[PDB]
């Protein structure tokens, strides 16, 4: 009781990964396939075959030269190990590797200070004390004028919106929602 292919790709210390596949043959036999993704080998892939012998869930490959590799079928996985039943392992890492690409364009939350006058909006972030320059749009600007009342004051502004680059190429903030303006309160309050 027990499958008889295995499908995967392993880590390479020399490339993208390595294309695995182990055949398990009714006549014990196997055949297993490596491939190398992104190789600077001469033979890019090679195969190898053998006879396996299977204890209770351990199970024990040996190759046409003798040399000998040990798994444990566990479900659907099979785990490779060292002789002793232990599962061999390499440590992950989690770092940003350098690159370049665009601004985000997924919406997050910002509470800021809006205040718009002469076509220019401007947007000073409650969180980063940072201030912003607004991409116009019409009804936002009304909607803080509404709000503001008879006074030329910044009202606090709770919006969804990302950063993109525009002319005159510079960062500025573009709304993804209606506005929620808070006139009576500041970045302090809540």
């Not at 479900?75 to 992950?92: H, K, T, V, W, Y």
Request: negative net charge; aromatic residues 10%; contains cysteine.
């Amino acid at each position: 009781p027990m499958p008889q292919s295995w499908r995967g790709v392993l880590p390479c210390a020399d490339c993208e990964g390595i294309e695995t596949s182990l055949f398990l043959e009714k006549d014990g036999t196997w055949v297993m396939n490596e491939r190398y993704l992104g190789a600077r080998e001469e033979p890019s892939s090679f195969a190898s075959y053998g006879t396996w012998a299977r204890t209770a869930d351990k199970l024990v490959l040996t190759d046409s030269k003798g040399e000998k590799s040990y798994y444990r079928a566990k479900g659907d996985a099979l785990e490779m190990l060292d002789r002793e039943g232990n599962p061999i392992e390499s440590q992950f890492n989690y770092t940003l590797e350098a690159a370049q690409s665009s601004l985000p364009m997924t919406p997050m939350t910002l509470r800021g200070m809006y205040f718009y006058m002469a076509d220019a909006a401007t947007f000073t972030d409650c969180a980063t004390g940072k201030r912003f320059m607004v991409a116009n749009n019409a009804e936002l600007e009304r909607s803080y004028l509404a709000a503001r009342g008879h006074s030329e004051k910044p009202v606090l502004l709770s919006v969804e919106g990302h950063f993109t680059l525009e002319g005159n190429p510079t960062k500025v903030l573009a709304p993804d929602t209606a506005g929620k303006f808070y006139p009576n309160q500041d970045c302090s309050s809540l």
